[PDB]
Amino acid sequence: EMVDNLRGKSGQGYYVEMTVGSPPQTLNILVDTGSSNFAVGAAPHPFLHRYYQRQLSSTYRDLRKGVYVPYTQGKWEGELGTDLVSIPHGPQVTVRANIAAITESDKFFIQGSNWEGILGLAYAEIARPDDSLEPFFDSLVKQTHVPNLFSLQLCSVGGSMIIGGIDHSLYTGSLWYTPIRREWYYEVIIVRVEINGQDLKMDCKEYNYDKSIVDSGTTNLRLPKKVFEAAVKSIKAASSTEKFPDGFWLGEQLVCWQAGTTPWNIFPVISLYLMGEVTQQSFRITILPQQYLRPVEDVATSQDDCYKFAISQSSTGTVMGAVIMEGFYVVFDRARKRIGFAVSACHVHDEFRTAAVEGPFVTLDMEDCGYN
Ligand SMILES: CCc1ccnc2c(N3CCCC3=O)cc(C(=O)N[C@@H](Cc3ccccc3)[C@H](O)CNCc3cccc(C(F)(F)F)c3)cc12
């Protein structure tokens, strides 16, 4: 009953239905593995269809503490409290959880996104104001018998968040696991990057400067500047039969082709090799251009298909965002401190190439690829 419990608009996040308070107030909540605060709009905003009304909830408790969270994109300010929370299309339980009631925000809520709050699924270590503010999933596990893991299948868009386990109908082939290096973000280690089979040939620590995370709340694959520049050079080289403005590669403008004629074949596959559970072993996930060229829906341009380049630069480490997660089934196995990847039932592919998760691979270089 949890399959297809996610919805969204492309590039604007995936959300699950939840209720907060007594009686239950229904809200759509963006699922974010890249943060650890549960926060909901709690005052009127031009882009909010609805919001949390604390005065109508008899179970609301004010914690008398303010909270501020600045993300890569957007920020909000709010008041901490606790209240009863449920997930109608998830486990049939009711949890008392911390909630940040958002009373002011800047460039956080998105016009027409259909969500009114955010569910930070990462660890307390990065919760604001500090790590004593227990994240939602921790509360869920402590207060119920739900097993300590969840899985995401990100595919108008839809998908599934399976709470408490793994749904085999959602993937094919094998699940490959990479260690969670540190429990704050879902931090992993990338050991090798290839563009159309060709190694970027960097010290592998560069791929994880200063950390690498799996983040459903971020759209792009974001790469450390040095890695980003190398990647773009290689993708340009592979696609050189056509020349695009420098602004496209910086994500500052779209590229468009007559509807139905996108030249997928001139763009390379990107392979990210993730550290395995065994010494010097790894597996790779392969990303097709249908993933990193993100379609931008606009009726005005609809004689064409237009795309934004969804790989961009980062000064805070690698972020494997939604365009990376889409088409894979990703298991956040908190209990065993590992992340699993498998090919999704809604995988990307044309008649020539297919997204893949495969291994094992062996590296001869014994360097630790972790930055710290
Ligand atoms: C879905 C909305 C969206 C669309 C398009 N682009 C987006 C984008 N960007 C910017 C450039 C490339 C890119 O993909 C970045 C983010 C973004 O910052 N995601 C947030 C969640 C969020 C969700 C909805 C609205 C705002 C934030 C996530 O927590 C970040 N994790 C690390 C993180 C960073 C900093 C602090 C924290 C902490 F404080 F929460 F821990 C976590 C959302 C984008």
Side-chain angles (χ1 to χ4, degrees), residues 11-13 30 32 34-35 69-73 108 110 115 118 126 128 185 213 215 217-220 222 312:
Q12 298 190 9
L30 182 155
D32 181 19
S35 70
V69 174
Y71 305 103
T72 303
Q73 174 175 118
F108 177 61
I110 296 177
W115 54 262
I118 183 168
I126 57 173
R128 308 294 185 95
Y185 298 94
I213 69 173
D215 184 357
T218 292
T219 296
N220 289 2
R222 310 187 56 228
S312 57

Side-chain angles (χ1 to χ4, degrees), residues 167-181:
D167 187 338
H168 296 292
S169 69
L170 299 190
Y171 71 100
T172 59
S174 298
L175 271 165
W176 284 88
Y177 289 94
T178 191
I180 296 172
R181 181 193 188 206

Side-chain angles (χ1 to χ4, degrees), residues 174-238:
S174 298
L175 271 165
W176 284 88
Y177 289 94
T178 191
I180 296 172
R181 181 193 188 206
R182 173 184 172 190
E183 289 155 305
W184 53 330
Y185 298 94
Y186 288 103
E187 181 184 351
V188 300
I189 298 290
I190 297 165
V191 305
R192 186 177 177 95
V193 179
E194 291 175 348
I195 306 300
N196 253 11
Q198 294 296 158
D199 182 11
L200 286 191
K201 297 193 176 188
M202 296 191 192
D203 189 306
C204 65
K205 286 183 190 291
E206 301 285 353
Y207 299 138
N208 308 291
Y209 166 63
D210 62 336
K211 63 182 177 294
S212 294
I213 69 173
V214 182
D215 184 357
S216 62
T218 292
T219 296
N220 289 2
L221 169 63
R222 310 187 56 228
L223 297 170
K225 180 173 175 186
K226 182 178 166 69
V227 181
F228 171 81
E229 293 299 343
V232 172
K233 170 182 166 175
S234 185
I235 297 171
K236 282 176 172 179

